[PDB]
Amino acid sequence: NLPWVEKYRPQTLNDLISHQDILSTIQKFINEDRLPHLLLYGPPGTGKTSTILACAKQLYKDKEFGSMVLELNASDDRGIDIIRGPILSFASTRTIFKKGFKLVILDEADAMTQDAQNALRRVIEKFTENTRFCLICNYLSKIIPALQSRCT
Amino acid sequence: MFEARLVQGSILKKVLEALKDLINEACWDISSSGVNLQSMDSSHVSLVQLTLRSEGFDTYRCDRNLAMGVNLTSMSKILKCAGNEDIITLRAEDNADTLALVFEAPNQEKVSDYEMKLMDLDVEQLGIPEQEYSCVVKMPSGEFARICRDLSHIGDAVVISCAKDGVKFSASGELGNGNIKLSQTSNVDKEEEAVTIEMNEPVQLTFALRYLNFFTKATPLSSTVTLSMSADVPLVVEYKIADMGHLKYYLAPKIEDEEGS
Amino acid sequence: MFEARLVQGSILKKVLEALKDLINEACWDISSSGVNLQSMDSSHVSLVQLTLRSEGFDTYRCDRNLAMGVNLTSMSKILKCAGNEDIITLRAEDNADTLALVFEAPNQEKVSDYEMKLMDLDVEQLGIPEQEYSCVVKMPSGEFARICRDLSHIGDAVVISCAKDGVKFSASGELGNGNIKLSQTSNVDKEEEAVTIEMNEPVQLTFALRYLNFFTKATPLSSTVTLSMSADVPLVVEYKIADMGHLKYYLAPKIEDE
Amino acid sequence: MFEARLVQGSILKKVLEALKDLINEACWDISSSGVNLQSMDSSHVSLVQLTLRSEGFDTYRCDRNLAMGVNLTSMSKILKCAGNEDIITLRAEDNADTLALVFEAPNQEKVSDYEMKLMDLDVEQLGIPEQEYSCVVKMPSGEFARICRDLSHIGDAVVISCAKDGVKFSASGELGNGNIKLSQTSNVDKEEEAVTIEMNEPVQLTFALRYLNFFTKATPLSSTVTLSMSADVPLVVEYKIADMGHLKYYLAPKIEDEEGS
Amino acid sequence: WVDEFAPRHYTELLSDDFTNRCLLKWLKLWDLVVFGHESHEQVLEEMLEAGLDPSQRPKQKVALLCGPPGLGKTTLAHVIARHAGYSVVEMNASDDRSPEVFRTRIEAATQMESVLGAGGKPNCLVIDEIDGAPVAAINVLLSILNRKGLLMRPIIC
Ligand SMILES: Nc1ncnc2c1ncn2[C@@H]1O[C@H](COP(=O)(O)OP(=O)(O)OP(O)(O)=S)[C@@H](O)[C@H]1O
Ligand SMILES: [Mg+2]
């Protein structure tokens, strides 16, 4: 039928395990509406995408998840046309929905170049109150220290 | 079985050029009240509601509710096919995969049956809160279109200020500031120039320019335009098109700069 | 010597704006009968037969039969600044490289003498096209241009079908299916609006819409166009201008029928 | 404090649409005689001399002589947001840099204050010779505009001739030869359609077509235009505004050296 | 920052007198066509005197002032063109990228019969940074040089 990972993917903050300090701090930030730009980094398959999707489905309903969350991944090439393309135009716009920030899930953020990470640094620092980025990556050291210095 | 007949063909031939460049598709919802069309833009900023009631049609046959998804690229060239004073009809079967638009050719000699396919699009209704608006303005339509064309030469984001004095449209660009303020135009012969203010508390909202130009693409539908705005409610542009129904545009404001002292 | 003065310049400007993208060059044959222009495309897709009789002009003088071929766009630059109501003087010598246009376009007595050079092209010969068309339909021209634009809006190729009721147009594409179906409306006050029927042996064909648009860019040239089609013979549109001559356009059907 | 009240915005609109494709930046000299604009183009070939008298405005007030310089395309886009029946208020002060254009709209209800930012360019004033020429021909302006558009197609630069008979236009272009000659056009009912020859000495000079085309965009300002040709002093195209002032365009020739053979 | 100490005459130039003398000789060589008036050093003096065009023009019509980017060659060309009876209409090849506006700034700006308001003040063309220009612009200038209308005003690249 379906693979077991797509069947038994965790959908709750308690259903993800061994990240209890991280999930506690994320819940503390998201109950008080103080969530920053996130940078989740680590080995593959340890619960990076599913944690932020659980947090997105905590923040947003099923109807507005497809509107106030933009997902980019390995299918999208990460150069300089993307950062001046859909993600900038997504982050620089308001929504007719409830007055909350947007969300951009950028899978494999360690594959961006230094120029691309600097342009993303410009986009992140320009728009903060209406967009909260989420860069998830394998290696922290493959991104610039300015990008590490603007997102938690 | 859905069957609708218009009184004059020019209703679609003025209402569908306003959706030529704004929205990408059309979601027709059928009901005993009539037809409606709610579509959000691809950038999720602009929202279009089109509500045509059943009493405005010449004849109207419907049995159950239907959701219908069509492409506006070929429809926006099929509007050029029909005439201006002919009679148009929309026909839709129960299980068919094509809808028919049956009208008369501009030669007044030839029956025109244009068949358009259905795109099975999975969309959901947002749901307008329909809150009490903090400022309502009644204005002419061509005046609003020419003031958007006027502030299209200055800056890419106009500023609508609405106080008890009236409405101030201000554009600031690299060239220089330009502001236009209206007040108390009830001393006119025709009733369509009554630029009236209906609420007290002032608001100041910055809107995009290309979106307001796409909104003012719908001038000859009606004579007057109702602009509703509040502190956090989006801009509502209401057109009372003829007697069959109305049209609404919903526009989120732009993001304000960090101008804290 | 060659000399022809057209009474009004809107006909010549409008036909040269009609075939501005159809052909690549215009070749006039000059005799005592009038001005003959028979042009054929490089890809064997369309043919133009324009005849201007000598009685339609105020003065037409011709000594020897001539054949002058000039690149259209060059004369399009000439008559893009002409007048709607003006006297046009088209002249050339017997053995010369030049061709002169003298006109008084804005009714401001500005005698504008414009000269252009002749292009020596290969003389290909097309004597007489065969005219044994079973299906003949007279239709008003401006609304024919309207429905040509209508069919060009939706599809990329037009399926045409004659029938005893009239002429049925269709087109298909991945966004929609355009269809239109003629009816007899002879009970009108306008004699141009009536469609005349001389059709037998109905034939279904297919055509390219852009060539139909290039044919029917000459909407205000005549009040009534004529369509003539049959099996495996190219379709003819025909404008009979009331004074100076006639114009015919030939389009071969596509290989992929229906 | 400089304040000028243009009676109608149509003449300003035609002045700016004449000067739009020629001048990089426009300089105004303000005195009790009125307003002056003596400037060169972006290529230092042509000269513009606009004079607007003091009595033509509704109210014209000026305390000290002012030498302002403004960007021209910015002012074209500012003036594009204006009607044709509205009074125009040009405002400037003694010790600042903002130029204000305050006018009414075609609604005739709303004020419109468009601010602009001037330039700090010091330009040496070139003395106009104000001498006599070799030929003066009076001709309606629509004839000159249509013959410039008609003669732009045949060639790239055109040689013009004037003699005792009349005026002559010649073009040796890539298409071929284009030659017109007009004289004694005074035998019509209208007073505008008239060509008058004043002087005696015949002149033949060649000029670029694009500068003539940009000169002919002042067509509906004046019913009649004046052409002054001379062998040494440049070509003069003068449009006389009816009750406001005048506008002169000066054009330098081009090199046409004879063949050595 | 060169406010009042700028050179303006031939007595304020900071180059060697042979180069300035031959540059002034080349500038005054055009008086037969513009005004209509009737070691390596010896090679330059031979090529500046022996043989001319039938239309009273020199063999070369463009000077290449190659050197380091400083050292005031532009100011030297300015004061020499002021001294020789011309007016300096400078232009820049670095802000001009499109060939259409280049031909506007070259073939539609100068080197025609630009009889201005000052009849006693003709004009000459001075171009800086010709090495950084794209090859289309220098091919256009080569076609202007090889045009046989005729080029009469000097070009100081
Ligand atoms: N903490 C966890 N508890 C339970 N199941 C988990 C946990 N983390 C991961 N899984 C399972 O492993 C799968 C992979 O999780 P994901 O977060 O989607 O992968 P990832 O952490 O984003 O790493 P990538 O995408 O390969 S770089 C999930 O769909 C679950 O089936
Ligand atoms: Mg992932």
Side-chain angles (χ1 to χ4, degrees), chain A residues 63 67 92 94 96-97 99, chain B residues 40 44-45 124 232 253 255:
Chain A
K63 50 180 194 303
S67 310
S92 58
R94 283 276 191 88
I96 333 179
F97 304 68
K99 304 302 145 60
Chain B
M40 190 181 285
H44 294 354
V45 187
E124 51 191 337
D232 293 70
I255 306 108

Side-chain angles (χ1 to χ4, degrees), chain A residues 71-92:
Chain A
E71 205 277 336
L72 299 172
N73 63 91
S75 59
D76 302 76
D77 47 323
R78 287 167 298 276
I80 210 61
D81 61 326
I82 163 181
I83 316 294
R84 288 193 292 270
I87 184 175
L88 161 72
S89 59
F90 193 86
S92 58

Side-chain angles (χ1 to χ4, degrees), chain C residues 2 12 15-16 19 25-31 34-39 50 52 65-72 75 90 99 101 116 118 121:
Chain C
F2 163 67
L12 185 70
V15 67
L16 266 308
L19 43 93
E25 46 87 20
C27 182
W28 306 269
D29 296 330
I30 298 303
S31 174
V35 187
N36 300 34
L37 179 126
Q38 190 164 12
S39 301
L50 174 61
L52 299 325
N65 306 328
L66 302 172
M68 293 183 284
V70 198
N71 178 264
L72 264 211
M75 82 206 54
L90 172 70
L99 175 80
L101 272 309
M116 293 183 284
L118 304 186
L121 76 150

Side-chain angles (χ1 to χ4, degrees), chain A residues 5 9-10 15-17 44-50 138:
Chain A
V5 276
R9 182 177 298 262
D15 294 1
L16 289 130
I17 42 185
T46 185
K48 297 190 293 292
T49 310
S50 55
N138 301 340

Side-chain angles (χ1 to χ4, degrees), chain B residues 9-243:
Chain B
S10 292
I11 300 151
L12 262 300
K13 314 305 146 180
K14 295 175 221 302
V15 88
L16 241 50
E17 286 93 325
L19 316 176
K20 148 79 180 298
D21 297 321
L22 183 55
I23 48 175
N24 42 320
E25 37 79 28
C27 181
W28 306 81
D29 185 24
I30 321 290
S31 62
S32 179
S33 61
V35 288
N36 63 276
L37 198 146
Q38 169 167 289
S39 302
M40 190 181 285
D41 207 334
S42 63
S43 312
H44 294 354
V45 187
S46 162
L47 184 56
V48 187
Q49 274 82 7
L50 169 97
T51 310
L52 316 177
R53 311 299 175 89
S54 303
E55 59 266 11
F57 289 90
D58 196 11
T59 173
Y60 191 69
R61 300 169 62 253
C62 68
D63 42 0
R64 293 182 183 174
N65 58 88
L66 298 176
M68 164 60 201
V70 63
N71 162 262
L72 294 178
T73 302
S74 284
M75 211 175 184
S76 302
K77 284 177 291 179
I78 294 169
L79 53 80
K80 301 184 179 184
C81 301
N84 55 338
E85 303 175 0
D86 49 349
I87 301 106
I88 70 174
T89 48
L90 275 77
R91 316 197 81 260
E93 315 295 322
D94 197 10
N95 310 318
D97 207 3
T98 327
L99 71 94
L101 308 111
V102 173
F103 48 86
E104 197 69 30
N107 207 8
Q108 203 37 245
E109 81 154 3
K110 174 147 59 184
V111 42
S112 181
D113 299 3
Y114 284 147
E115 300 278 352
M116 199 168 302
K117 63 160 286 295
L118 188 147
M119 170 56 63
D120 205 332
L121 185 59
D122 203 316
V123 283
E124 51 191 337
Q125 306 300 101
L126 164 65
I128 308 111
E130 294 121 5
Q131 210 259 330
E132 177 88 356
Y133 309 106
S134 299
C135 259
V136 176
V137 186
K138 190 160 300 301
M139 230 163 54
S141 190
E143 184 264 351
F144 192 30
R146 73 171 182 84
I147 214 57
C148 286
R149 185 164 42 101
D150 277 6
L151 300 190
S152 300
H153 288 62
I154 299 307
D156 299 339
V158 314
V159 174
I160 323 283
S161 176
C162 209
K164 206 55 187 176
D165 307 67
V167 175
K168 167 177 161 294
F169 315 134
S170 178
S172 295
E174 319 286 339
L175 280 64
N177 311 274
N179 58 90
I180 294 109
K181 42 198 65 178
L182 289 95
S183 186
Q184 293 177 335
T185 299
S186 64
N187 301 24
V188 284
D189 297 359
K190 316 168 186 176
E191 308 176 12
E192 56 178 341
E193 296 94 15
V195 185
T196 64
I197 290 286
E198 315 285 340
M199 212 59 65
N200 31 5
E201 67 272 61
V203 289
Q204 279 172 331
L205 307 110
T206 310
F207 297 103
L209 175 78
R210 185 179 38 87
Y211 279 140
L212 268 174
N213 283 254
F214 286 156
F215 284 178
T216 53
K217 295 305 183 306
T219 59
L221 271 65
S222 59
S223 307
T224 31
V225 166
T226 300
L227 292 111
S228 301
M229 50 182 49
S230 175
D232 293 70
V233 182
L235 161 93
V236 192
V237 199
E238 302 210 18
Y239 290 75
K240 281 291 298 180
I241 165 180
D243 297 317

Side-chain angles (χ1 to χ4, degrees), chain A residues 4-10 15-19 23 42-51 107-108 136-138:
Chain A
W4 289 13
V5 276
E6 276 73 43
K7 285 187 176 185
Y8 303 142
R9 182 177 298 262
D15 294 1
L16 289 130
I17 42 185
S18 182
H19 309 329
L23 291 169
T46 185
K48 297 190 293 292
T49 310
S50 55
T51 288
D107 213 348
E108 303 107 355
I136 49 179
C137 50
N138 301 340

